[PDB]
Amino acid sequence: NTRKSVRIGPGQTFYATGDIIGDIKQAHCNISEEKWNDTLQKVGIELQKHFP
Amino acid sequence: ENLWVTVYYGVPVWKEAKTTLFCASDARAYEKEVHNVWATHACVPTDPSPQELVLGNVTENFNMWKNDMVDQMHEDIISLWDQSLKPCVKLTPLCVTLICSDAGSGGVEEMKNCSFNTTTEIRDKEKKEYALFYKPDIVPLSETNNTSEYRLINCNTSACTQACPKVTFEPIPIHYCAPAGYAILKCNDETFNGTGPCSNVSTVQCTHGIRPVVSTQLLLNGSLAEKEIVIRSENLTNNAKIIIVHLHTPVEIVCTRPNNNTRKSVRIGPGQTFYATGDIIGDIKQAHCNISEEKWNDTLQKVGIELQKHFPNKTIKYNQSAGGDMEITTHSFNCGGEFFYCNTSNLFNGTYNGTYISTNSSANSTSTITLQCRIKQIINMWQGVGRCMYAPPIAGNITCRSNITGLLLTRDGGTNSNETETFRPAGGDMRDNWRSELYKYKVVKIEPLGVAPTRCKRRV
Amino acid sequence: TSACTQACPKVTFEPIPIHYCAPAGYAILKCNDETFNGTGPCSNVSTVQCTH
Amino acid sequence: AVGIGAVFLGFLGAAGSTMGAASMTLTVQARNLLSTVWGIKQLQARVLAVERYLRDQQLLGIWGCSGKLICCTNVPWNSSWSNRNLSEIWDNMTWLQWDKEISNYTQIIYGLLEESQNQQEKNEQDLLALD
Amino acid sequence: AVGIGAVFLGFLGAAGSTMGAASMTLTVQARNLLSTVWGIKQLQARVLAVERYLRDQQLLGIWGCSGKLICCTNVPWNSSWSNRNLSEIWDNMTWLQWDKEISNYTQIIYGLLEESQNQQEKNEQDLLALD
Amino acid sequence: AVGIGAVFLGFLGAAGSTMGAASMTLTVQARNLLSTVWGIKQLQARVLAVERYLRDQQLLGIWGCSGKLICCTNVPWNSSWSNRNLSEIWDNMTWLQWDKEISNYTQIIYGLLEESQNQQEKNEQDLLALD
Ligand SMILES: *[C@@H]1O[C@H](CO)[C@@H](O[C@@H]2O[C@H](CO)[C@@H](O[C@@H]3O[C@H](CO[C@H]4O[C@H](CO)[C@@H](O)[C@H](O)[C@@H]4O)[C@@H](O)[C@H](O[C@H]4O[C@H](CO)[C@@H](O)[C@H](O)[C@@H]4O)[C@@H]3O)[C@H](O)[C@H]2NC(C)=O)[C@H](O)[C@H]1NC(C)=O
Ligand SMILES: *[C@@H]1O[C@H](CO)[C@@H](O[C@@H]2O[C@H](CO)[C@@H](O)[C@H](O)[C@H]2NC(C)=O)[C@H](O)[C@H]1NC(C)=O
Ligand SMILES: *[C@@H]1O[C@H](CO)[C@@H](O)[C@H](O)[C@H]1NC(C)=O
Ligand SMILES: *[C@@H]1O[C@H](CO)[C@@H](O)[C@H](O)[C@H]1NC(C)=O
Ligand SMILES: *[C@@H]1O[C@H](CO)[C@@H](O)[C@H](O)[C@H]1NC(C)=O
Ligand SMILES: *[C@@H]1O[C@H](CO)[C@@H](O)[C@H](O)[C@H]1NC(C)=O
Ligand SMILES: *[C@@H]1O[C@H](CO)[C@@H](O)[C@H](O)[C@H]1NC(C)=O
Ligand SMILES: *[C@@H]1O[C@H](CO)[C@@H](O)[C@H](O)[C@H]1NC(C)=O
Ligand SMILES: *[C@@H]1O[C@H](CO)[C@@H](O)[C@H](O)[C@H]1NC(C)=O
Ligand SMILES: *[C@@H]1O[C@H](CO)[C@@H](O)[C@H](O)[C@H]1NC(C)=O
Ligand SMILES: *[C@@H]1O[C@H](CO)[C@@H](O)[C@H](O)[C@H]1NC(C)=O
Ligand SMILES: *[C@@H]1O[C@H](CO)[C@@H](O)[C@H](O)[C@H]1NC(C)=O
Ligand SMILES: *[C@@H]1O[C@H](CO)[C@@H](O)[C@H](O)[C@H]1NC(C)=O
Ligand SMILES: *[C@@H]1O[C@H](CO)[C@@H](O)[C@H](O)[C@H]1NC(C)=O
């Protein structure tokens, strides 16, 4: 929800979190499976040069 | 018979440039203590022989409204005002509620009493104190119709910083020298309207005495014109450009005050002390500014006959400013250390119709014009600097024996088929003041190299 | 009257000796008369770049 | 026209006279190229003056004109830069109009002078190595 | 190194060539040697750049070799510093490894140049006093 | 004067002596001028040092005798500045009281030297363009 303006002192207001409207879900990040898998495979085949 | 390139070093040519300029002040302001106004600790002492040279065939193109010196002076004065308020008392603990009543049994009616609860030097204990605050500095802090709870106007936007009562706001004149390799030209023409060619360009290594006064209307102490009224403006077609009038003869102005008792020392925190107004011994009278009547009348008539050149068959009228807060529509200035905000409804109440009216009376000079002034203490001049300076009060009566040199009019938006164009006063930013003063000068860059062909072939 | 700033317990007040040196283009005149009372002419004037 | 009376011209004093009387006045105009919020505006100006004077002195000293004022080079003057007479240039103008008509054609001139200076130094080294 | 035309490369763009062909690329490439707390750091950088340039100019001016780029003197070159042929030096060698091979024997050369200039100035004063 | 030999001090050791031992000492004197709250003074000393050195070299370079340490010039010596004999000047006094006697007329002498140098270079350009 909107930052809630809480005024403290002369003109030194700070903005804290107000409510949460709607349902509450979880923050997350999304990476594809195939691209990450063959990227790690390519990192493996270029790290295989330094280790016999 | 052939031509060869020949290099000359010391060629007098110019390009336009922007640079950083000096400060030069007179030697009498250095013999006192440190931190008097701004110039004791900073500016170089100028030599008492300014060398001015007149150039023979030189014609140059000046531009008053396209200048870097005005912007540089504005930035320097903003930085100086922000620097001078750094080691001063920050009155944060004065945000408490003020219990205010009337000043007495039919007493002042302009200054409230406003006794408050303050912090002493020991943060465990508190002591009851009092002052006398002005009416424009107090707002009625109340969620209901309560006439006893008040607060200051400054504890709502951003703090304060009380001005240190050992520096003075006296406008000492400052010169602007140019760096080495740079020159400052100066147009000595008489009919110079601000923009256009000049036929008498001169050489000045460091400009004349510029007094940095602060005023909204009615430009105070400064350089006059030379032979007639000169009117400076940018376009004279749109009604958003501040037309500047440069007077030829000054008109005397004097302003006064009643007698405060003393500044009251109230201690807050570990060693900080803000000074506030104590009693007002004697009677309670008004602060007013006095202008002579006949001199203002024929000065305004001469401005009319010089402004009728640009408008051929139209009458000239004047009225008040176009509404708003007291910091814009009133003639405001600062001398004696106490700020004034004076009404100007009697000065600009008149008209001109193209027919001259003589004033052949020398014994009628007793008649004059009085202006009802108001005095503030919390000061909000310049936006973006921390404009909450608290001006401390001063003990005795004050007098303002001053001098006027200009006006800042503004044309009103005319209606259809009108012949009664009215001119209203207007204030605005300080670039109008410092461009009315710095209209002559222009900074250039010297390029000494230069090639030219001749018959000189270098011997091998 | 004022407010203290407590001296932070890592600096020392030991008087380390310093030499005052003139810039390049200036010289410091030093008088080597043993009976010099402070004011008056000297006779064994020596020129040194920096003080003792 | 060496007699000006009081010799105080200050970068500008002969900026209106003709070029014949403006080549006699180079010394008084070349003499003056060197000589807290306001404690730093004084100190930046000295540094920029020293920078500009050093740049001008280096650029003069690249193509052989070490300390001379009226110095002469052996770069042939192209006719596609002026297309005017010699006496018309030296009599009917001052330096300001010439700077206005030369300002597009300066970098080619500077490159030609520096190339001719390199050729002169190489030929001088070869001539001194001949002996 | 003369058909470049548009010279904007500095000393950066000509190294690695032979020093016979790298001695004609000096003029604009040496013209490129000059062109709160951040302001003090920048102004210190400007001051040290000016001081370095004037130290180089003073070093050229001490041993009578100022105002010239290719500037050759009469100090006898000791064979122990190089011990190699001139044709190899000026045809099959660059400036970088010459600087690597000469950096241990610079102060003796500088002192010899200063002494030779002092002797030449004494001879010049003697020739002035003779006439 | 010149027979000191081991000269690492320099400075102003010939002060208070005869001009005959103070004019021929310049061949061996040479020059040694450029031989937080304490970081703002290093900068100011460095700027005033480089400004003084550049001012001295510019004043030596306007009247066209750069890097010579003795300049014979053909400005005629007016009798109103000395009114006296040459031999007692060169064999009786020191430089300090001579500076005290001559400091009222330094600017006129400097202007005469600048005018004579400009006349010399204009005559040199004319004579070298006759051919
Ligand atoms: C436009 O131009 C006018 C004309 O110059 C200016 O008006 C002057 O304003 C200044 C201050 O702004 C006035 O100076 C003050 O004068 C007071 C009265 O002076 C009389 O009394 C003293 C003895 O006390 C006599 O020596 C003097 O000759 C007068 O007879 C003084 O009391 C003031 O003193 C204050 O300052 C000093 C030093 O800073 C302190 O030591 C004091 O404690 C005190 O704080 C001050 O000197 C001056 O008198 C005005 N001139 C005239 C002719 O009246 C305008 O300011 C100027 N600008 C504007 C915007 O209008
Ligand atoms: C403002 O109010 C204060 C407090 O009521 C007044 O101070 C009092 O003055 C009387 C004299 O009339 C004293 O007897 C009291 O002791 C004072 N009270 C204090 C010091 O707390 C003050 O006079 C009022 N202001 C004016 C201008 O009258
Ligand atoms: C200040 O005065 C007294 C003493 O501390 C106290 O009782 C009172 O509540 C305070 N506040 C006001 C507004 O008077
Ligand atoms: C107090 O500040 C707010 C903005 O923060 C403003 O809207 C309001 O008008 C101010 N109060 C007064 C009395 O001006
Ligand atoms: C130019 O201005 C100067 C200022 O003193 C004046 O003396 C001179 O006469 C003016 N020039 C002309 C042509 O009037
Ligand atoms: C401002 O001046 C220009 C130039 O004369 C003109 O073209 C323009 O119309 C003017 N502006 C207005 C609003 O008339
Ligand atoms: C001045 O402005 C006011 C504001 O509306 C207007 O009523 C009046 O007619 C104008 N002119 C005069 C002469 O007062
Ligand atoms: C000025 O005076 C006029 C009439 O005297 C009055 O109507 C007006 O309210 C006053 N104040 C302002 C700010 O105009
Ligand atoms: C303006 O002038 C007229 C005529 O002198 C006068 O009647 C009037 O009272 C003045 N003041 C105002 C506010 O109109
Ligand atoms: C007001 O102060 C001035 C000082 O300039 C003084 O001359 C005048 O007498 C004072 N007024 C009264 C009523 O004393
Ligand atoms: C204002 O005019 C008066 C009248 O001549 C004069 O005495 C005074 O010096 C002028 N003010 C200034 C600041 O020059
Ligand atoms: C002058 O000082 C030097 C410094 O070592 C000393 O050797 C000499 O004896 C002194 N002369 C007199 C007369 O004191
Ligand atoms: C200005 O022009 C006139 C007209 O040719 C000329 O006689 C005069 O010498 C010029 N001024 C200067 C200072 O050269
Ligand atoms: C006094 O000065 C003269 C220079 O004329 C010098 O030869 C002599 O040695 C000096 N006296 C002493 C005691 O050093």
Side-chain angles (χ1 to χ4, degrees):
Chain A
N1 192 358
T2 304
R3 65 179 64 88
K4 179 164 62 65
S5 67
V6 180
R7 185 183 272 106
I8 46 169
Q12 312 287 310
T13 187
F14 77 105
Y15 314 87
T17 300
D19 291 331
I20 291 184
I21 62 170
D23 216 1
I24 288 191
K25 299 306 202 251
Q26 193 174 5
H28 59 272
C29 291
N30 269 350
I31 311 186
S32 299
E33 167 74 34
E34 294 293 328
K35 302 275 201 175
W36 184 250
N37 212 10
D38 79 324
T39 289
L40 266 182
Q41 282 279 315
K42 280 179 173 61
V43 165
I45 73 167
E46 309 266 350
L47 279 170
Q48 205 73 342
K49 309 254 179 52
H50 298 251
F51 300 107
Chain B
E1 294 172 328
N2 260 344
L3 301 202
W4 307 79
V5 192
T6 285
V7 183
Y8 288 90
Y9 182 63
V11 172
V13 292
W14 300 294
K15 283 332 191 283
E16 273 295 349
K18 311 199 282 214
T19 182
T20 66
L21 311 159
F22 284 175
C23 171
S25 195
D26 297 329
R28 58 215 62 176
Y30 302 107
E31 305 152 345
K32 324 289 178 304
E33 303 98 22
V34 288
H35 302 285
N36 290 119
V37 296
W38 53 84
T40 310
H41 204 80
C43 309
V44 304
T46 183
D47 46 340
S49 59
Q51 303 254 30
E52 191 195 2
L53 186 69
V54 186
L55 305 189
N57 289 185
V58 176
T59 69
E60 266 281 315
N61 267 15
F62 285 86
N63 204 348
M64 191 185 47
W65 308 97
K66 282 305 282 296
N67 214 330
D68 53 349
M69 301 175 98
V70 176
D71 295 329
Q72 192 161 142
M73 201 206 196
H74 186 58
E75 273 307 308
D76 275 357
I77 287 190
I78 285 300
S79 296
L80 269 173
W81 211 272
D82 192 28
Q83 175 188 113
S84 173
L85 295 185
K86 187 64 66 69
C88 289
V89 175
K90 179 166 297 261
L91 55 92
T92 300
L94 260 64
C95 294
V96 294
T97 59
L98 305 194
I99 305 295
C100 317
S101 183
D102 211 1
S105 58
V108 182
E109 204 261 331
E110 199 65 36
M111 311 185 48
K112 308 283 257 186
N113 198 1
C114 295
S115 71
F116 49 89
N117 195 302
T118 198
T119 313
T120 184
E121 69 273 16
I122 312 298
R123 56 182 262 280
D124 303 87
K125 334 282 211 193
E126 308 296 18
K127 51 161 184 175
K128 200 108 181 192
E129 281 265 6
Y130 80 105
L132 290 202
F133 291 108
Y134 281 90
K135 256 179 183 168
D137 312 342
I138 317 166
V139 292
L141 182 63
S142 66
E143 68 270 13
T144 181
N145 194 29
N146 209 318
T147 66
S148 291
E149 296 288 330
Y150 282 93
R151 79 160 163 84
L152 279 79
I153 202 168
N154 63 7
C155 289
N156 182 37
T157 75
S158 54
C160 277
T161 300
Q162 184 218 16
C164 286
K166 58 179 285 186
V167 306
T168 61
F169 306 124
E170 197 205 3
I172 301 299
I174 48 173
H175 317 305
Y176 279 158
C177 292
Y182 287 76
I184 289 186
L185 306 170
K186 169 179 167 182
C187 173
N188 292 12
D189 216 15
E190 297 149 352
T191 53
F192 186 52
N193 62 297
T195 61
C198 191
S199 300
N200 201 5
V201 177
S202 167
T203 302
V204 174
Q205 73 168 114
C206 204
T207 76
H208 72 275
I210 296 159
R211 324 191 61 121
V213 294
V214 178
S215 168
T216 60
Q217 294 84 18
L218 306 179
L219 303 183
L220 295 180
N221 308 329
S223 58
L224 310 160
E226 291 285 18
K227 84 191 301 293
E228 46 186 35
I229 315 284
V230 186
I231 292 148
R232 330 268 177 184
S233 180
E234 180 152 47
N235 217 325
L236 289 171
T237 314
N238 50 345
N239 290 318
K241 299 307 176 180
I242 306 189
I243 180 171
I244 306 176
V245 186
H246 209 77
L247 285 188
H248 172 47
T249 54
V251 167
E252 183 97 349
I253 190 167
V254 288
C255 314
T256 61
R257 211 172 68 91
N259 190 16
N260 284 145
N261 201 36
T262 181
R263 40 182 67 180
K264 190 187 187 298
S265 314
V266 181
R267 179 169 295 126
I268 50 170
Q272 313 165 26
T273 293
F274 65 99
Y275 284 82
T277 304
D279 213 357
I280 314 168
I281 62 170
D283 212 3
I284 313 298
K285 295 309 203 271
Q286 210 168 6
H288 60 279
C289 286
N290 270 356
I291 294 183
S292 181
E293 162 76 23
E294 315 292 326
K295 312 280 191 182
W296 183 252
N297 214 0
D298 65 353
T299 297
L300 183 63
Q301 261 196 352
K302 280 179 202 68
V303 171
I305 74 161
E306 217 64 48
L307 204 43
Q308 187 177 2
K309 307 282 185 63
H310 303 256
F311 311 110
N313 283 317
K314 289 188 183 292
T315 56
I316 301 299
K317 280 170 69 66
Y318 317 93
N319 48 350
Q320 313 144 10
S321 193
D325 213 5
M326 71 180 312
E327 295 177 348
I328 300 169
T329 81
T330 48
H331 164 45
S332 81
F333 55 94
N334 184 13
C335 63
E338 201 76 19
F339 290 84
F340 278 81
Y341 288 88
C342 298
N343 204 0
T344 44
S345 281
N346 316 97
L347 263 53
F348 290 88
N349 176 33
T351 176
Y352 187 51
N353 69 322
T355 46
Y356 201 90
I357 298 178
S358 182
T359 48
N360 196 235
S361 200
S362 301
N364 218 5
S365 57
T366 309
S367 182
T368 177
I369 298 178
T370 61
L371 307 181
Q372 330 287 337
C373 300
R374 278 164 154 266
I375 292 176
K376 281 182 75 184
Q377 280 192 2
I378 286 172
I379 301 299
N380 280 47
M381 311 175 258
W382 292 313
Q383 296 90 299
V385 69
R387 40 160 188 160
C388 282
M389 182 179 72
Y390 178 83
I394 53 176
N397 82 309
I398 55 172
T399 306
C400 179
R401 199 150 283 105
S402 178
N403 184 301
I404 196 172
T405 81
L407 296 95
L408 293 185
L409 313 171
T410 286
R411 209 170 50 155
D412 207 22
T415 176
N416 48 302
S417 309
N418 216 11
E419 289 87 5
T420 59
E421 268 173 347
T422 64
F423 285 101
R424 305 176 180 275
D429 44 352
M430 294 299 291
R431 300 181 165 94
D432 316 315
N433 280 53
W434 302 327
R435 194 179 295 116
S436 71
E437 193 77 279
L438 273 158
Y439 74 103
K440 279 178 162 180
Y441 304 105
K442 192 188 67 150
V443 60
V444 294
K445 170 174 51 154
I446 310 299
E447 293 179 353
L449 290 172
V451 290
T454 176
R455 305 263 180 84
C456 182
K457 144 162 171 53
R458 191 204 281 190
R459 209 163 39 198
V460 177
Chain C
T1 78
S2 166
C4 289
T5 300
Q6 181 213 17
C8 47
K10 291 174 71 175
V11 293
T12 64
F13 311 100
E14 176 92 344
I16 295 298
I18 52 177
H19 311 279
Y20 269 82
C21 293
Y26 287 75
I28 296 178
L29 282 185
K30 157 183 186 171
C31 171
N32 297 347
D33 213 28
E34 293 155 347
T35 73
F36 189 53
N37 78 301
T39 311
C42 188
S43 298
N44 208 26
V45 179
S46 167
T47 294
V48 65
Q49 182 59 249
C50 303
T51 70
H52 64 270
Chain D
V2 68
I4 211 68
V7 293
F8 307 100
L9 300 202
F11 317 102
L12 318 189
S17 51
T18 64
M19 281 205 199
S23 81
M24 212 67 40
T25 176
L26 307 163
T27 65
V28 65
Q29 308 203 48
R31 202 201 300 113
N32 296 115
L33 274 296
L34 264 189
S35 298
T36 318
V37 70
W38 270 337
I40 203 78
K41 295 185 72 127
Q42 184 186 173
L43 188 153
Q44 291 178 356
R46 310 203 175 277
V47 179
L48 67 91
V50 164
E51 284 279 344
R52 259 174 44 88
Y53 170 65
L54 267 187
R55 283 201 221 131
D56 273 338
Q57 203 82 9
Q58 183 178 2
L59 183 63
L60 190 66
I62 287 171
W63 50 77
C65 308
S66 66
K68 309 178 294 178
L69 311 168
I70 309 178
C71 169
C72 281
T73 48
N74 46 5
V75 165
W77 178 257
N78 204 299
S79 302
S80 60
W81 289 329
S82 82
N83 279 314
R84 314 171 61 110
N85 290 342
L86 188 153
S87 62
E88 181 168 346
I89 283 170
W90 289 114
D91 297 347
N92 272 327
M93 292 180 183
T94 184
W95 278 100
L96 285 164
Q97 293 96 23
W98 187 253
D99 174 48
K100 275 190 273 188
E101 318 193 328
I102 194 66
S103 194
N104 263 346
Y105 313 150
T106 54
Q107 311 300 314
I108 315 162
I109 284 180
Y110 288 169
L112 282 177
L113 267 68
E114 294 175 60
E115 285 174 6
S116 77
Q117 163 76 10
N118 260 321
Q119 209 47 62
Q120 267 184 75
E121 301 265 30
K122 182 67 181 294
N123 290 359
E124 198 83 39
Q125 170 153 79
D126 268 350
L127 202 173
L128 262 173
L130 266 181
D131 286 336
Chain E
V2 77
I4 300 183
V7 186
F8 46 85
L9 73 165
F11 300 132
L12 280 296
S17 298
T18 61
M19 331 196 298
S23 83
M24 294 182 286
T25 184
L26 266 49
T27 45
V28 181
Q29 298 86 344
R31 195 188 162 274
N32 265 293
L33 268 172
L34 273 185
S35 74
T36 187
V37 285
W38 311 115
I40 300 182
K41 197 182 294 294
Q42 188 211 18
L43 188 153
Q44 267 162 2
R46 285 190 191 276
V47 162
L48 67 91
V50 162
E51 276 272 352
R52 215 175 68 112
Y53 168 67
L54 260 183
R55 185 70 203 161
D56 277 342
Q57 274 305 310
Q58 274 186 5
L59 264 185
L60 265 73
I62 282 171
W63 52 68
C65 196
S66 72
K68 299 176 69 65
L69 297 175
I70 297 169
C71 182
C72 53
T73 60
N74 61 333
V75 172
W77 173 265
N78 206 346
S79 183
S80 47
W81 297 322
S82 71
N83 284 104
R84 55 202 313 139
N85 216 335
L86 187 143
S87 294
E88 158 166 5
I89 282 175
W90 288 98
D91 292 315
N92 286 337
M93 187 144 158
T94 80
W95 272 112
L96 273 298
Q97 66 268 18
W98 177 258
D99 163 78
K100 270 170 202 164
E101 283 184 17
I102 211 67
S103 68
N104 272 22
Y105 317 105
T106 60
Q107 325 297 131
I108 305 168
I109 297 187
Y110 293 161
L112 277 160
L113 282 153
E114 180 171 340
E115 285 180 351
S116 67
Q117 175 62 30
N118 262 307
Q119 192 50 55
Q120 188 274 331
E121 263 188 354
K122 285 294 294 298
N123 289 344
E124 179 51 55
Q125 197 144 308
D126 266 345
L127 279 183
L128 181 71
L130 261 180
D131 291 331
Chain F
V2 65
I4 297 174
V7 193
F8 84 110
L9 294 163
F11 263 121
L12 283 72
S17 174
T18 302
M19 291 215 198
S23 83
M24 72 158 196
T25 198
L26 308 187
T27 55
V28 68
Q29 183 62 255
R31 270 289 98 189
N32 79 326
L33 290 177
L34 278 75
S35 61
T36 183
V37 76
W38 271 334
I40 211 64
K41 288 185 183 291
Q42 297 294 322
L43 185 141
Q44 203 155 353
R46 199 155 37 169
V47 175
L48 65 92
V50 69
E51 270 204 315
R52 273 191 49 89
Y53 168 70
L54 273 181
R55 271 201 270 126
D56 270 321
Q57 295 298 109
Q58 185 217 3
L59 280 176
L60 261 174
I62 297 169
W63 41 76
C65 67
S66 188
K68 267 181 59 59
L69 279 158
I70 287 173
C71 320
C72 285
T73 57
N74 51 58
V75 162
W77 178 255
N78 207 318
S79 285
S80 75
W81 302 323
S82 66
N83 286 115
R84 74 202 292 220
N85 189 359
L86 184 84
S87 171
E88 61 77 15
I89 280 181
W90 282 97
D91 299 300
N92 196 81
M93 293 180 183
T94 69
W95 275 110
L96 290 158
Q97 41 189 326
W98 171 251
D99 174 58
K100 272 182 273 188
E101 291 196 320
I102 211 66
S103 196
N104 265 343
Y105 313 108
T106 50
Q107 297 295 322
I108 311 163
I109 289 173
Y110 287 171
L112 282 189
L113 261 67
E114 292 162 28
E115 288 177 9
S116 66
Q117 166 74 22
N118 214 338
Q119 201 54 54
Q120 262 194 0
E121 280 182 351
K122 194 54 180 283
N123 288 349
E124 163 87 19
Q125 188 204 19
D126 269 338
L127 189 140
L128 192 142
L130 289 174
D131 277 319

